[PDB]
């Protein structure tokens, strides 16, 4: 499932967490996909939606919170956002 594919990406692909590094990558266009928590500021959410609209990147909304997403990526802190730059192994970019 999704957390399994995300762990695969943690192992194979590469990524950056958090709003600042995420939107930096998105400004650079280097990213492909974002996953966004559901506990989240709606302002931050909509701003990322706009940024990804401009970049033509993909977006996915996580049925979970910062805690859940953090456990998914394998880290032990809050993550409202994650930017997938490339997966290599996973079907993340293909599915959804």
């Amino acid at each position: 499932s999704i957390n399994q594919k995300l762990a695969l990406v943690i192992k194979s692909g590469k990524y950056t967490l958090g709003y600042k590094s995420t939107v930096k990558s998105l400004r650079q266009g280097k990213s492909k996909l974002i996953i966004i928590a559901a506990n989240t500021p709606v302002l931050r959410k909509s701003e990322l939606e706009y940024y990804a609209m401009l970049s033509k990147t993909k977006v996915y909304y996580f049925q979970g919170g910062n805690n859940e997403l953090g456990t998914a990526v394998g880290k032990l802190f809050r993550v409202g956002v994650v930017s997938i730059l490339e997966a290599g192994d996973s079907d993340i970019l293909t599915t959804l």
Binding site: N39, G65, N66, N67, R78
Partner: protein
């Protein structure tokens, strides 16, 4: 170390007021002094300011609720049944 067997926070009340009332007060004092989770941010910065004022220091928010807990089960049922009938009505 380990201070108290079973009085806990109700050792400040000493030898007064009867064991039973001290038990009830113990239960509710724990509930009201505990830290809770702000739903908007997931952090453990939620506390009571006053009865049914439960505010989060990190995310600078406030929610109305029970005097001693932040979500009372009755109101939980009400949330659920409201969502139910609202889904039905829009449906």
């Amino acid at each position: 170390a380990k201070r108290t067997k079973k009085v806990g926070i109700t050792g400040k009340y000493g030898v007064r007021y009867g064991s039973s009332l001290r038990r009830q007060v113990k239960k509710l004092e724990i509930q009201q002094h505990a830290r809770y989770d702000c739903s908007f941010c997931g952090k453990k910065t939620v506390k009571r300011g006053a009865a049914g004022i439960w505010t989060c220091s990190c995310c600078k928010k406030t929610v109305a609720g029970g005097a001693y807990t932040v979500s009372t089960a009755a109101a939980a049922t009400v949330r659920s049944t409201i969502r139910r009938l609202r889904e039905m009505v829009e449906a």
